[PDB]
Amino acid sequence: EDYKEGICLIDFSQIALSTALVNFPDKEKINLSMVRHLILNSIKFNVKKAKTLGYTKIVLCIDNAKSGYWRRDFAYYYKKNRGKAREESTWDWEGYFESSHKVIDELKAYMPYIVMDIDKYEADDHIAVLVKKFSLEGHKILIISSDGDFTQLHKYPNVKQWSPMHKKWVKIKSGSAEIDCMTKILKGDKKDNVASVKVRSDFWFTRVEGERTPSMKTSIVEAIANDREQAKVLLTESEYNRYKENLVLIDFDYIPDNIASNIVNYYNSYKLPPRGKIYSYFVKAGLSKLTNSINEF
Numbered sequence: 305e306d307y308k309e310g311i312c313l314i315d316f317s318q319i320a321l322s323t324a325l326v327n328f329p330d331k332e333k334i335n336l337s338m339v340r341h342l343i344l345n346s347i348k349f350n351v352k353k354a355k356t357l358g359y360t361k362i363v364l365c366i367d368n369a370k371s372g373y374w375r376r377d378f379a380y381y382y383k384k385n386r387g388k389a390r391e392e393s394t395w396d397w398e399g400y401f402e403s404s405h406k407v408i409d410e411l412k413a414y415m416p417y418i419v420m421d422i423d424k425y426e427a428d429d430h431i432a433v434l435v436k437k438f439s440l441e442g443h444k445i446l447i448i449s450s451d452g453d454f455t456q457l458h459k460y461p462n463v464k465q466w467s468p469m470h471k472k473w474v475k476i477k478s479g480s481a482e483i484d485c486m487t488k489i490l491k492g493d494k495k496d497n498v499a500s501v502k503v504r505s506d507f508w509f510t511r512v513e514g515e516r517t518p519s520m521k522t523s524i525v526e527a528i529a530n531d532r533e534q535a536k537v538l539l540t541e542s543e544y545n546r547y548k549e550n551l552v553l554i555d556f557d558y559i560p561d562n563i564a565s566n567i568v569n570y571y572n573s574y575k576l577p578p579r580g581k582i583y584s585y586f587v588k589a590g591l592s593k594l595t596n597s598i599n600e601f
């Protein structure tokens with residue numbers, strides 16, 4: 305093992321939720337014990353994975369949208385399409401989230417991981433900012449994320465990504481990273497209500513029947529990807545101003561100073577619990593099958 309240890313960042317909320325959507329049936333209350341068991345089982349599996357690959361420092365990166373998103377404070381329509389979807393569902397989202405927040409606080413109090421959890425901050429924020437930090441500090445980095453796109457981090461040395469769901473390595477140095485990032489910035493990212501620079505910013509949220517997004521030439525995307533100064537040249541003023549907006553929504557380098565510094569400061573001041581707390585936590589929570597496996601956490 306290295307003097308600057310290998311660090312594992314886990315895209316954890318998405319892993320737990322994906323597992324929960326398989327394990328927990330529709331039309332049944334999702335309770336604290338159910339969620340605690342699932343979260344701890346998932347941690348056990350993915351920590352073993354990190355440790356065998358040679359990464360010893362475990363950081364659990366959490367999605368916390370209890371009060372929304374910092375990006376939404378900037379662009380109100382951001383990710384509003386997602387909440388719309390859950391409103392309908394007969395799956396117990398309310399119970400899941402309520403219980404997950406409780407378990408996360410238990411992790412903070414008792415388990416030996418850095419739990420990056422800040423209301424209105426996304427797992428991808430923690431990962432992007434900590435990768436920049438750790439990479440410059442000379443740590444090898446492993447991202448555990450089933451479907452996350454981290455190709456924006458292609459410039460950082462010694463960053464690998466493992467996907468638990470697909471059981472395979474994921475490309476970080478994709479060869480088309482900048483063009484793929486710029487495609488989202490210019491053409492939008494509908495899955496997150498991010499709109500093309502050729503329409504009003506809240507297009508996806510306020511779309512009226514019949515409305516269409518004007519097409520944009522791939523060559524403009526490629527041109528601006530290769531030299532961003534060309535944005536002032538190939539885009540109209542209105543499109544350029546929308547471009548500036550979308551940079552904040554998509555590009556990791558445009559995470560605001562206060563947001564990024566809050567992430568770093570949270571990491572630095574983190575109160576790591578002594579490993580002695582693991583056993584007493586398992587006993588307290590009645591996880592009697594796990595008091596046997598303390599060494600696997």
Ligand code: NA
Nearest residue numbers: 411412415417
């Ligand atoms: Na902790």
